Design an enzyme around this catalytic site. Structure first.
Site, PDB file in Angstrom:
ATOM      1  N   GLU A  74       0.874  -1.173   0.000  1.00 55.75           N
ATOM      2  CA  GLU A  74       0.000   0.000   0.000  1.00 55.75           C
ATOM      3  C   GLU A  74       0.911   1.223   0.000  1.00 55.75           C
ATOM      4  O   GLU A  74       1.514   1.550   1.029  1.00 55.75           O
ATOM      5  CB  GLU A  74      -0.927  -0.013   1.210  1.00 55.75           C
ATOM      6  CG  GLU A  74      -1.805   1.218   1.278  1.00 55.75           C
ATOM      7  CD  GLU A  74      -2.525   1.353   2.610  1.00 55.75           C
ATOM      8  OE1 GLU A  74      -2.893   2.492   2.961  1.00 55.75           O
ATOM      9  OE2 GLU A  74      -2.715   0.331   3.304  1.00 55.75           O
ATOM     10  N   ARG A  88       0.977  10.232   0.779  1.00 56.26           N
ATOM     11  CA  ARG A  88       1.318  11.100   1.895  1.00 56.26           C
ATOM     12  C   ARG A  88       2.570  11.927   1.660  1.00 56.26           C
ATOM     13  O   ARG A  88       2.949  12.710   2.546  1.00 56.26           O
ATOM     14  CB  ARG A  88       1.490  10.272   3.173  1.00 56.26           C
ATOM     15  CG  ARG A  88       0.232   9.584   3.632  1.00 56.26           C
ATOM     16  CD  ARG A  88       0.492   8.823   4.920  1.00 56.26           C
ATOM     17  NE  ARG A  88      -0.548   7.844   5.164  1.00 56.26           N
ATOM     18  CZ  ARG A  88      -0.563   7.024   6.209  1.00 56.26           C
ATOM     19  NH1 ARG A  88       0.415   7.091   7.113  1.00 56.26           N
ATOM     20  NH2 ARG A  88      -1.552   6.140   6.349  1.00 56.26           N
ATOM     21  N   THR A 144      -4.344   6.098   1.442  1.00 59.05           N
ATOM     22  CA  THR A 144      -4.634   7.519   1.703  1.00 59.05           C
ATOM     23  C   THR A 144      -5.293   8.164   0.487  1.00 59.05           C
ATOM     24  O   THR A 144      -5.069   9.338   0.159  1.00 59.05           O
ATOM     25  CB  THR A 144      -3.377   8.294   2.127  1.00 59.05           C
ATOM     26  OG1 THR A 144      -2.514   7.443   2.893  1.00 59.05           O
ATOM     27  CG2 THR A 144      -3.771   9.480   3.005  1.00 59.05           C
ATOM     28  N   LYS A 146     -11.468  -0.980   5.565  1.00 59.46           N
ATOM     29  CA  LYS A 146     -10.458  -0.690   6.571  1.00 59.46           C
ATOM     30  C   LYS A 146     -11.167  -0.192   7.821  1.00 59.46           C
ATOM     31  O   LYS A 146     -12.141   0.557   7.733  1.00 59.46           O
ATOM     32  CB  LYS A 146      -9.472   0.360   6.053  1.00 59.46           C
ATOM     33  CG  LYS A 146      -8.245   0.519   6.934  1.00 59.46           C
ATOM     34  CD  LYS A 146      -7.081   1.133   6.176  1.00 59.46           C
ATOM     35  CE  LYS A 146      -7.007   2.620   6.427  1.00 59.46           C
ATOM     36  NZ  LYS A 146      -5.922   3.271   5.649  1.00 59.46           N
TER      37      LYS A 146
END
Lengths: 206, 209, 210
Positions: free
Chosen positions: A42, A46, A70, A130
């Site tokens: 993943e 960011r 994200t 998630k």
């Protein structure tokens, strides 16, 4: 969706939450994860170089389950699809993001932290989520309570998962896998401790 | 989005602690305000929690036009329009709805909405908000929650409120995504009832300096 | 609304969260509850026979406050209304479910766990909510903080409520009742332990003060 959400969860007991600050670290970090038995990555959105890191990883190692995390907005979702991501993970959900994942070619894994958020995702056809940030949003007691009412929903708890507690989460019937950075710690990435990272991954993938 | 003359970050920058003001008696409004000003606090959140609240808000704004006086517990678009019409320089809410966020983006006056989960934060961001109340902070995950959010939304700024007090507020202020905190402990209802304005000033001075 | 949400909350300090696996247990379980002072029944939509049990209870005891729990979808809400349910309780809420409850004579009690979720329900006309899962979603501190900003909103905390903590929840000014399976444990239902169920219910009925 040729790749099903359940495939993003079945690939590894632990999904590494990867922060890549320097593009030169992307490929040796990936090789270290592969050598440690981890074939799902993943790449979190960011850092400024994250998209370029995702593109480089997919171009180099296309036969791995490399996706983005994200993913907050539909625009980012379309960006990571265009970059070749195999999946998109989000720390939460919005209606716009849920709509975007319905018509997409790659699976979206939205994040939820309350029963109502779960129910909104379920109403849109999602049943893999998630749970974020797991340890601060109710932890194992929350997941047990949800399992009593939504036994078929599958979760990847992330946020405060570590060596000491990750097995306790994985043992829950509605937890398919967990996510976290403890097997890819920023200090080891920054300092190029690639064999160490392989060893940390081996401890959880075997 | 969020092009208000008064920016939320300026509201957050005015004091390390925004007082959560509950005014039950209209006669208390002016001396309470004087006690806050004397204690170095020049941002006042008049909560919409009492029958006299709108009147107290209007009185304070008309009496002290140069102070940063706004409203809290703004739940509906109707209440938001009410506090705008009363002259509030900002509105704070304990949570958010689409209609409330829409109202704030149509207004000359900034809205600081409340969030408690990442999905709520993400809906706020989608409407151009990046300054939020985190409420009720201590019961909604506290410092670990804020730390988890900071790693994923480093630019978003919070005012944690709800269970913040003298013993823990510095622990919250030290977080990189916390711009200020909110609470009633510097304007406690017991001191207001006793007209203990010296105590309120002393409590405020302790946090403002 | 033929029955008001506040009437559902006012019936008993504890709403029994019923998981019914065998249809023949429905009538004898109702007798054990009635004998303990409890006339509100939440039949959860968690077993294959739940709808049939709901219909059986309502047709047998039409004057009791018998409703459905674990109502997740608008389709389930329409099913339980057609089944005769006197109320519907959900573990959470969606816009679609809130809209469906607006169009019914049967009260819907949505579940919330944050102030924003509460505010979405309020904006659509709701001010009686389940707080779920109460013990894992912030517990008594969460409810106390909400009571200061929404004194008009009433809650039924459920999830992790038991005989050791329910009175602490009930003492809160914004808690009208609680929900739990501990007064109707599945083992006692399976084994026809009506005397235990009645004893548990009698204990909570002596806490009813209005």
């Amino acid at each position: 969706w040729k790749t099903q959400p359940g495939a993003v969860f079945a690939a590894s007991p632990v999904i590494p939450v990867i922060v890549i600050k320097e593009l030169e670290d992307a490929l040796p970090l990936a090789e270290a994860l592969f050598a440690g038995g981890i074939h799902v990555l993943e790449v979190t959105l960011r850092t400024p170089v994250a998209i370029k890191a995702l593109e480089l990883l997919i171009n180099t190692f296309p036969d791995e389950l490399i996706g983005a995390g994200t993913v907050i907005t539909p625009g980012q979702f379309h960006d990571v699809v265009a970059a070749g991501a195999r999946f998109a993970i989000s720390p939460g959900q919005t209606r716009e993001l849920l709509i975007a994942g319905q018509k997409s070619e790659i699976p979206l894994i939205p994040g939820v932290a309350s029963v109502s958020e779960l129910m909104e995702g379920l109403g849109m056809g999602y049943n893999h989520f998630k749970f974020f940030p797991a340890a601060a949003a109710g932890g194992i007691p929350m997941l047990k309570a949800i399992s009593g009412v939504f036994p078929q929903v599958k979760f990847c708890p992330t946020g405060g998962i570590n060596s000491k507690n990750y097995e306790e989460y994985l043992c829950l019937p509605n937890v398919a896998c967990v996510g976290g950075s403890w097997i890819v710690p920023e200090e080891a990435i920054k300092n190029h401790n690639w064999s160490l990272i392989t060893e940390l991954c081996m401890a959880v993938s075997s």
